[PDB]
Subunit: 243 residues, 4 copies
C-alpha cells in the first residue's frame, strides 16, 4: 500500500463541487490516515460522512477565510500528529471552490487561503518532507483568482523547497456531478467540452483523485512547482474545425 | 499490482543517458510485461541485460531513424500482442536522447521518430486504449527539437484521442549519472542546477521512472496532452538573488 | 504625427517607479492630448509638473482604490471628451505600482483597479474604438497580483473586443531609476539582471514609453490580449552557465 | 521618418501568403532602404514589382534552403552595405511560408533557414546593432516547425544579444488574401476565426506590416526574445460559449 502510515489533512469535503471527497477516497484507498476539515458546524454533516467512510483520525473545524481559525485547526492537528518520534504531515490538500469586493473575496478564499495553510502547516510538512496540493477548476473574476492561485504554487514551491516540501496543483477539467448537472447552463459546458476535448469525454472524479494521490505520493518525489492538467486534454486543444 | 497484464514497448534502453532503464524497471516492478527495442545489433548488449532483469517478452531491433525498421519492428510486436481476444498495447515509451544537417538530424531522430512510432503503434494502442510517452531532457539545436517534440505531443493527443489513446511527455531535470558524471562540464550543470532548483537537488532516475509509470498507468486515465516536468522544480525557478 | 488628435487618460504619474511619466512623454511627443490623474491632493505636485510639460487638457483626482473616486473622475473626463461629434477616448493607461491583508491590498490596487477603470472607461473607449494598457514590473504577493493582472488582460480583451476595444499589457524589466537606485538591495537586482539579460543591459524608461506608445497607437490595431515583455530579453533567459 | 537611412534585407516577397510585401511597404513608408530577395529566377517577377514600388537598392537571389546560396547572397549584400563608415544592416526579415521527409523539409525551410540567415547576417547586423524578425502563421507538421522556429528566437536572442542584436517573431493570425480566399476550405477557417477572435475580425496585412515595422524600429530597442501575436486576440481566446 503506497501510503501506509502517511498523514494527510484534506480541506474542502464540505463542497459537493470540490472533488475533495474523491481525493480523500483515493488517499484512504492506499492506506493513508486522514484528518478532514469542515468550514462551519453548519456544514459538517458531509464531512462526518467522509470521516465515517474513511476512518478519519479527526474532524477539525477550519474556515480557510480566517488566519485564527486556521491557527486553531493546526494547533489541534499538532496535538494528533505534531508529537511522537515520527511527528509530521505527509500532505495538505487545498480543494476549496462583479464588484471589487467579489474579486477581493475570490482572491482571499481561493488564492490567499492556500498560502495561509502552507504557513500554518510548514513545520509539520517539513518534519516528514511532505507536500501541498491545491485544485483549480475549468470564467469570471475566478479566472484572476485561478492565475493568482497558480502563481502561489511557484512561489511556495520555491520558498518551501529548501525544507524538502513539494508544492503542486491540479487543474481539473469540467466534471459531470449530480446537482452541478441540474443547472442546465453548466450542463451545457459539459456537453460542449465533451466534444471539444481530445479524449471526447469529461474526466471523472476518480481520475482527479488518482492524479491527486500520485502528486501526494512517493512516486511524485521529483515533482514540485507543477500545474498538472487533468482534463482529458481540454486545455491543450486547438481550433473548432467544423463547429 | 497496478499494471498486471499490461503490455509496454520500451524504446531507448540502449542509451545510458535515456532513463529508459529506470522506466522499464518501474513498469516491470508493477507487473507490466515488456518488449524492449535496440537500435542496432551493435548496441544490443545493454538491452539484453534489461531483457534479462525484466523478463522481456521479446527484444526486437528498432532504429527509430527509419520508417521501414519501425514497420518491421511493429510487424513483430503484432505477432506477440496483435493477436488473441485481448490483443493490443497498453503503452509505448519513446525515450531516445551546428549545421542544418545537425538540426535536420536532431529533428528526425528526436522529434519525428516519435510521430513515426505513434503511427506504427496506433492500431495496437487503440485496441487497449493505451498511451504514448516521450521524454525530453534539460541547449543547442536540441532546444529546437525539444520544442518540436513537445508540439507533437499536443498534435498527437488531439489526433489519437478519438481512439482513446492518451499522449504525454515527461520533461526530466539534469540527472547525475555515471560517465555522464565523468565529463567535467556536464558535471558542472549538475552542480549548479542542484543549487538553483527549489528542492536543492537533482532528480533521480527512480523519480523519472515512477512519474513515467504514473502517466502510463490507469491512475493517469484523465490526463492527455501534458508535459510533466520532473525536475525538482528547476523549470519553474525565478532569479538568482545572490549568485 | 502618429497620434494627432487622439486622447489618452494616463494614470500613475504620481509614482516615481511607475514609468507613467515616460509613457506620457512618448504619447505627447506624437501629438496626443493627455488627461493625467493624481491619487491624492497630497501627491499632485509631480502630476502638475507633467501637466505643465505635456500641456495636459486636464488634471483630475483619481484614487484607483475606490469605485466612486473612479466614477467621479470619469464623470469629469466625460465633460471634456464625452461630448462633441468626435466624442470618446483613444486610450487609458494603467501604470500604478506578508498577511492576507497585504495580499488583499495588492490585488485590489494592482489588479482589480484595472478592471475598475476598464468598466468606467468602456463607453468612451468604445466611441473611438480605443485601447487599455496596463503595466507589470519584474517577488512577493506581487507575483500573485501580477498573474492576476495579466489574466484580467485576457478576460477584458475578450469581453471588450466586441466593441472594438483592444486590451494589452507591458511587462517591464528592472529599470535603473534615481532613488530606486539608492536602495542598495534593489541596486543589486539591477546589477544582476544587467548580466543575465540577452542584451546585457536593463531597459530604459524611454524604451518602455515607446513600446507603450506602439500598443496605444494605430500601428497596434491588430493586437489585443497581449503581454509585451520590454525587458531586454530577461524573461526569456535560460540558465547561468558560469555564474 | 522613423527609419531614415536604415537598411533592411527582406526575404519572402516571392510568396503571396508571406505578408512580406506589406512588411516591405511598411518599412519603405518610413524611409528605410530595402534589399529584397527572390528564391529562384523563376519566382523573381513579384519581387521585381516590389523592387519597383519600393525603390529597392538591390534584388538578390537567395534560396533559404541552401547555406551556399545564402552565403553568396550575403557576399553581395556585403558589397552594398558591408563597406563605408556607416557599414551594417538595421534588420533582416524572415517571412517564408505526412512523412518524415515532409517534417524534415518543413523544419529545414521554415525553422533552420532562420538560423542560417542569422549566422550569415550577424557581422552586418552587429555593425549597426540591428535585429532579426521571423514570421509564424496561424495545423500539420507545420505546428512542430512553428514551435521549432519560436524556440530558435529565444536561442538566437540569447546568443546574439551580447552583440546588441535583437531577435523577435510575429505570430500572425489567419489573414484573408486573394487566392488564399479562393480555396473554399481556408475560406472557412477565416469565417470561423472572425467569429472566434476577441475583435471579431481577422487582422489585415497592414496590421502585420506595422507590427513588424515596430519590432524592427528604434521604438522596440528594449524588446528581444519576443513572440508578438498579431491576430486580433485569436490565440488568447477561451471556450465557445454557444457555438
Ligand atoms: Ca504541467
Ligand atoms: Ca508576447
Amino acid at each position: 500500500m503506497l501510503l501506509k502510515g502517511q498523514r494527510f489533512v484534506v480541506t474542502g469535503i464540505a463542497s459537493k463541487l470540490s472533488i475533495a471527497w474523491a481525493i480523500a477516497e483515493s488517499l484512504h484507498r492506499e492506506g493513508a490516515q486522514l484528518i478532514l476539515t469542515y468550514p462551519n458546524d453548519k456544514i459538517k454533516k458531509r464531512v462526518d460522512m467522509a470521516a465515517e467512510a474513511f476512518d478519519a483520525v479527526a474532524v477539525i473545524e477550519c474556515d480557510v477565510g480566517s488566519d485564527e481559525s486556521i491557527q486553531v485547526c493546526f494547533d489541534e492537528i499538532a496535538k494528533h500528529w505534531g508529537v511522537g518520534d515520527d511527528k509530521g504531515i505527509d500532505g495538505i490538500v487545498h480543494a476549496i471552490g462583479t464588484t471589487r469586493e467579489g474579486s477581493q473575496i475570490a482572491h482571499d478564499i481561493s488564492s490567499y487561503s492556500f498560502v495561509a495553510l502552507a504557513k500554518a502547516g510548514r513545520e509539520l510538512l517539513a518534519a516528514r518532507q511532505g507536500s501541498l496540493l491545491t485544485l483549480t477548476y475549468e470564467y469570471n473574476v475566478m479566472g484572476m483568482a485561478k492565475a493568482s492561485l497558480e502563481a502561489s504554487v511557484r512561489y511556495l514551491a520555491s520558498s518551501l523547497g529548501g525544507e524538502g516540501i513539494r508544492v503542486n496543483a491540479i487543474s481539473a477539467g469540467p466534471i459531470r456531478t449530480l446537482a452541478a448537472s441540474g443547472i442546465k447552463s453548466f450542463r451545457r459546458m459539459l456537453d460542449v467540452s465533451e466534444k471539444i476535448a481530445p479524449l471526447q469525454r469529461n474526466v471523472s472524479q476518480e481520475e482527479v483523485g488518482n492524479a491527486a494521490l500520485f502528486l501526494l505520493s512517493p512516486w511524485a518525489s521529483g515533482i514540485t512547482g507543477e500545474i498538472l492538467f487533468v482534463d482529458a486534454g481540454f486545455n491543450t486543444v486547438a481550433i473548432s474545425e467544423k463547429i
